[model samples]
Target: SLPLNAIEPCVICQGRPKNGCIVHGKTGHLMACFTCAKKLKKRNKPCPVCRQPIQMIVLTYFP
Candidate 1:
């Protein structure tokens, strides 16, 4: 297994998601947090990784 720090942290805020990860539908980039995800949703932007229509597929959790 890879080291814990080796994994790419949240792309937006650079914070650690741990078990709570939100991924881009087409590209699988982990968003920083729900706030960032909803911010993207509010604006309707393409996937940060693959440039696909913004789609919420795998959102691990939020508060």
Candidate 2:
């Protein structure tokens, strides 16, 4: 966890997807968020990219 910066909260180093994410792979169901799922899909597959079950970090602010 990180400290709050007045109104905005500090960035967390969780990486990629948040908690409780569900990712699909050839092996089985993995933990991942919607964003990670999309990236994995775009990359052709998830298992290979992640090198694990899931690879979604928390506190990722988008532009």
Best by TM-score: 1
Give Cα-based local distance difference scores for all models: 0.57, 0.42
lDDT of 2 by residue, 25-56 (tens): 43433334456555655665536544554434
Candidate 2 has its poorest 10 consecutive residues by lDDT at 4-13
Residue 61 CA error for candidate 1 (Å)? 5.8
lDDT of 1 at 28: 54
Residue-by-residue lDDT tens digits, candidate 1, 1-63: 354454445667657553334455535545355656667777887766678666663556433
Top candidate when judged by lDDT against the true structure: 1
lDDT of 2 at 53: 48
